[PDB]
Amino acid sequence: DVLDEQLAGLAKAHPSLTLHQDPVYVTRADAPVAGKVALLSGGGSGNEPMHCGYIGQGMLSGACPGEIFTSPTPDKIFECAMQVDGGEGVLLIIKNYTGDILNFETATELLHDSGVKVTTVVIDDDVAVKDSLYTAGRRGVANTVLIEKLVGAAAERGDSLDACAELGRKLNNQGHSIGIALGACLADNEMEFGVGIHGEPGIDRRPFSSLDQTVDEMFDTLLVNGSYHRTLRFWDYQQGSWQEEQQTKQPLQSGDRVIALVNNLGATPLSELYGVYNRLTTRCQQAGLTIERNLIGAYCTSLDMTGFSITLLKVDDETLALWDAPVHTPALNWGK
Amino acid sequence: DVLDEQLAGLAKAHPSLTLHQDPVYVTRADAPVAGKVALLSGGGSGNEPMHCGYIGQGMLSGACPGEIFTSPTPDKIFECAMQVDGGEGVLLIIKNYTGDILNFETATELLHDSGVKVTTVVIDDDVAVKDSLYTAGRRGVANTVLIEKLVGAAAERGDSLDACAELGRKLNNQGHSIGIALGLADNEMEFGVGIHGEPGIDRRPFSSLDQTVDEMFDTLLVNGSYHRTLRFWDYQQGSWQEEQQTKQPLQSGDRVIALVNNLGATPLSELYGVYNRLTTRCQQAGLTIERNLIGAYCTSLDMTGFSITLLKVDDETLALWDAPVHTPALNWGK
């Protein structure tokens, strides 16, 4: 009942979104938007504003909330995708959770069989742990926000479904996150190091010394666990089947230009995030990493968890242009 | 050196801001902005993004933070005002705490004597408690954000200092806030809490979110009417002037802006729940919500709780609301 109230609250607060019922999902009020690739994502509730706060021009066409930390069911994704298709196809952005993979796969196959041009982007940016509670491989966390915006800008520009997907998968290979918690959504002055956004265990528990030192070791870990080989699955709409792809991520390195997301996991004071950004900037400078753009705030939460995550995404000039492009969502608003 | 690191983080993240040192204050990087009334505010650290996240075009020209929950010293205010004045004068916005009142007063008077056209707007929107720990009269809370935007838009349009101050004062007489905290024992809430952790009306039980909103909404109505004396700087006379003023409660036919504000550690999903119930009570009482803001706009560090603010508006102030704003915490328009 409280999930419904929250969803009705979102709809009343934002007349530019439409709350659908039977089954439940959220789209832009003007969807289907003709002439442009539609972008869709979704996942459990409890990560707000992800994803419902990112519905609007220059970002998501729609999103399908599940129950708390629980993948939406495939009827929500299918119907939402049908709702948002504007004749150019629908790109599904999927965080690497087993329930999310399972459910978005089911929908995608069926959408293709229903005549909708579709393909998929998997997000696996969390560098901490391989094969956590609900994940085969690495977890999909805050970098999803950054990809949704960048791919959103590409779609809004009028790039083909293939160009959008390719951009998303490439950005996926160059984004790197890690989170810490000081309290659950742990002993005294002890942090869960490398925590995930649905309450999952991290690398371990360790002492929390200071914000600066916590940041140093988060930063170091981005570098140390940066290298990553794995197989991902994507929908080939030409062949009309799942295709296994082997991709390797390279660590960030001196010379790289980055977007930095310093993200509140739920209950960290905002002053402290600037303290985190301050230390992050110093460590990037010393490594030869140039932070070109940043976001600081509550973008990918875990209910009321006390902690924060850091995300660094390699970018170029073309990507910065996509960053700087307009976006109009509840949670991210700039440009004309 | 946490506070210093934090402010350094802010200057690094926002090249559109200048962090000044000796004394410490923040301004727009293009301050002084000639041709417009400058807006300045300040207060203790710990209410972020209030105030430094409100520095930019269409809102504040600068801000003066203090220590944790502690008024900025008058040197910061004096120096910030001087830095931001663009020849059209400086409007100081002040939340009603005794240390804020004194230090702002000290700076306002000295500024006038140093040749700066200056006046003041005092914020006392918290309906909960008269004479809290650090306040004579009513506490100044999240309506500050709404006034700072609306007055910010008026300044940016080119309204005079007098017109800007008069608008600020009128809005302060039409805006109504209350907050609650859950962190207190099991399922208990501090009702009518402040943003520095001052006591509320009492401790009471927390039954449900909807029930909490209902009682917050009722209190906005019940404590709506308020008469008190406020002091402002008359720059024509060169003196403090007292004015007896009265707020009317919210009533049927009123149109309002709503701010559902995170006091620090409330999940965003829950604020939409609050907003849902708030609209229901508003519509039931014949109040129209025209615009809304939901999120973390006036915090109290990592407090578990939230506040509701309702500000009566008309067509003219809606136009000021819709006007561009470009700050770290509020960004829209061309």
Curated annotation (Swiss-Prot), chain A:
EC number: 2.7.1.121
Positions bound to dihydroxyacetone: G44, S45, G46, N47, K95, D100
Domain DhaK as annotated: residue spans: 1-332
Signal peptide: none
Reactions the enzyme catalyzes: dihydroxyacetone + phosphoenolpyruvate = dihydroxyacetone phosphate + pyruvate
A GO CC term attached to the entry: cytosol
Induction / repression: Activated by DhaR.
Pathway(s) where this gene product acts: Polyol metabolism; glycerol degradation
Residue positions of the active site: N47 (proton acceptor), H198 (tele-hemiaminal-histidine intermediate)
GO terms for biological process, alphabetical: carbohydrate phosphorylation; DNA damage response; glycerol catabolic process; glycerol to glycerone phosphate metabolic process; ketone catabolic process; monosaccharide catabolic process; pyruvate metabolic process
Principal EC category: transferase
UniProt cross-references to SUPFAM superfamilies, sorted A to Z: DAK1/DegV-like
InterPro entries for the chain: DhaK_1, DhaK_dom, Dihydroxyacetone_Kinase
Keywords: Glycerol metabolism, Kinase, Transferase
GO molecular function: glycerone kinase activity; identical protein binding; phosphoenolpyruvate-glycerone phosphotransferase activity; protein homodimerization activity
Domain of life: Bacteria
Activity regulation note: Inhibited by chloro-3-hydroxyacetone and D,L-glyceraldehyde.
Assembly mode: Homodimer. The dihydroxyacetone kinase complex is composed of a homodimer of DhaM, a homodimer of DhaK and the subunit DhaL. DhaL also forms a complex with DhaR.
Misc remark: Unlike the carbohydrate-specific transporters of the PTS, the complex DhaKML has no transport activity.
The protein's role, per its UniProt record: Dihydroxyacetone binding subunit of the dihydroxyacetone kinase, which is responsible for the phosphoenolpyruvate (PEP)-dependent phosphorylation of dihydroxyacetone via a phosphoryl group transfer from DhaL-ATP. Binds covalently dihydroxyacetone in hemiaminal linkage. DhaK also acts as corepressor of the transcription activator DhaR by binding to the sensor domain of DhaR. In the presence of dihydroxyacetone, DhaL-ADP displaces DhaK and stimulates DhaR activity. In the absence of dihydroxyacetone, DhaL-ADP is converted by the PTS to DhaL-ATP, which does not bind to DhaR.
Protein name per the record: PEP-dependent dihydroxyacetone kinase, dihydroxyacetone-binding subunit DhaK
